[PDB]
Amino acid sequence: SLLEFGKMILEETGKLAIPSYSSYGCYCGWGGKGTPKDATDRCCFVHDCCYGNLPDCNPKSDRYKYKRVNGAIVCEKGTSCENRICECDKAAAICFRQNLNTYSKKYMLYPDFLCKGELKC
């Protein structure tokens, strides 16, 4: 679920999902066009594609369980949708962590009109 993804993001990065990643660039929280602005935005692009791989799942509301094995996120077994949603979220959270070094506050609240063109997943 979105709240769980948010908790995962905070655990990984120390930033609150809202507002640090809810309106970032072209793809983080609400976005489907444009060239991703940087590596963090590409995390969201891929995450959006990942959710797109699950048309019959409900990633925003369906809850999954996960644990930590010495820092590492381990998605626990739920329904097939839950497992796949968790893997998408885990990847994005790790990606945000991997790219914290280039995160730029100038991409927060990024205006929609600066996001043009469809990029295939």
Binding site: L2, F5, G29, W30, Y51, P59, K60
Partner: peptide, 4 residues
């Protein structure tokens, strides 16, 4: 909830 905001999308993704």
């Amino acid at each position: 909830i905001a999308r993704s």
